[PDB]
Amino acid sequence: IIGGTECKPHSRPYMAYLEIVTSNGPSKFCGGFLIRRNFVLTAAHCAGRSITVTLGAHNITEEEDTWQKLEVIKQFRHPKYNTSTLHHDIMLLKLKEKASLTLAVGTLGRMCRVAGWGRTGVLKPGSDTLQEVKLRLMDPQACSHFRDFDHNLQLCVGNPRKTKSAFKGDSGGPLLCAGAAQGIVSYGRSDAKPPAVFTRISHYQPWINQILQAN
Numbered sequence: 776i777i778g779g780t781e782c783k784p785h786s787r788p789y790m791a792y793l794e795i796v797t798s799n800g801p802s803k804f805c806g807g808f809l810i811r812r813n814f815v816l817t818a819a820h821c822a823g824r825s826i827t828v829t830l831g832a833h834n835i836t837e838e839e840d841t842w843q844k845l846e847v848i849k850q851f852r853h854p855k856y857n858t859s860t861l862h863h864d865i866m867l868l869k870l871k872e873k874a875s876l877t878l879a880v881g882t883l884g885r886m887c888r889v890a891g892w893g894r895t896g897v898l899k900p901g902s903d904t905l906q907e908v909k910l911r912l913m914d915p916q917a918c919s920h921f922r923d924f925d926h927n928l929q930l931c932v933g934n935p936r937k938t939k940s941a942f943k944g945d946s947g948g949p950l951l952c953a954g955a956a957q958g959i960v961s962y963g964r965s966d967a968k969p970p971a972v973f974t975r976i977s978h979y980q981p982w983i984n985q986i987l988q989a990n
């Protein structure tokens with residue numbers, strides 16, 4: 776998160792920290808969010824050989840009793856997810872156990888908020904602490920320069936005149952508008968120049984409910 780503020784600890788108890796494992800490279804990291812006790816929503820580009828979800832985190836380097844490190848038993852990438860275009864960049868993670876409900880862990884032109892543990896700058900390292908930034912929802916034409924952006928599939932997010940932006944490692948986290956998740960952090964420019972592309976959750980609601988009722 777670039778240009779944001781450290782969240783009040785555990786003020787966003789649905790936030791998930793994903794440690795993704797690959798067979799040929801080191802750990803990667805994404806965000807996500809708990810929508811059911813045993814289901815986390817994230818971006819499909821965050822898929823890997825195996826994922827661990829940490830719920831209840833603020834400072835992700837200091838283990839605390841709020842933490843719930845939960846095994847993921849299966850990854851549900853959108854069946855139409857495309858690695859070239861990043862269309863349908865959405866994925867459900869089924870947790871091994873149902874998470875405990877705690878004060879720190881629970882389920883979930885307008886301005887919206889996005890939170891994450893990603894880098895605070897292009898050449899800055901990932902954040903120790905969960906950070907949040909307020910971003911503007913833009914008309915689709917502001918994301919035209921992303922040639923594979925599509926208004927029905929995706930939100931365009933972030934005033935280009937500001938440096939405020941999600942960035943590397945914030946992938947998969949929710950964009951919340953007036954209290955409700957509307958978007959999932961997907962992609963943007965290597966120079967962190969806003970705006971960025973977010974998955975439009977509403978388009979995928981039928982698909983989400985199909986997976987949830989089948990598992």
Ligand SMILES: Cc1c(Cn2c(=O)c(C(=O)O)cn(-c3ccc(N4CCNC4=O)cc3)c2=O)cccc1C(F)(F)F
Nearest residue numbers: 859860923941942943945960961962963964965967971
């Ligand atoms: C994740 C993030 C990034 C990260 N990011 C890069 O850092 C980076 C680079 O070259 O380093 C490239 N991409 C990137 C850009 C474009 C693609 N697309 C476009 C269509 N198909 C592609 O392959 C893929 C990846 C990033 O998302 C940048 C700005 C904001 C944000 C976020 F807002 F989404 F959080």
Ligand SMILES: *[C@@H]1O[C@H](CO)[C@@H](O[C@@H]2O[C@H](CO)[C@@H](O)[C@H](O)[C@H]2NC(C)=O)[C@H](O)[C@H]1NC(C)=O
Nearest residue numbers: 781782784833834835836837838902903904905
């Ligand atoms: C998050 O937790 C880590 C680890 O406990 C903190 O790291 C310390 O940072 C200070 C400087 O701020 C160093 O001088 C210490 O040596 C570090 N301690 C350890 C044990 O690593 C970090 O500051 C915390 N960040 C927060 C709360 O924002």
Ligand SMILES: *[C@@H]1O[C@H](CO)[C@@H](O)[C@H](O)[C@H]1NC(C)=O
Nearest residue numbers: 855856857858859860861923
């Ligand atoms: C992804 O998108 C490209 C370009 O739009 C298309 O030609 C290709 O069939 C797709 N590939 C996969 C594997 O989904």
Ligand SMILES: [Zn+2]
Nearest residue numbers: 784833839841
């Ligand atoms: Zn705590």
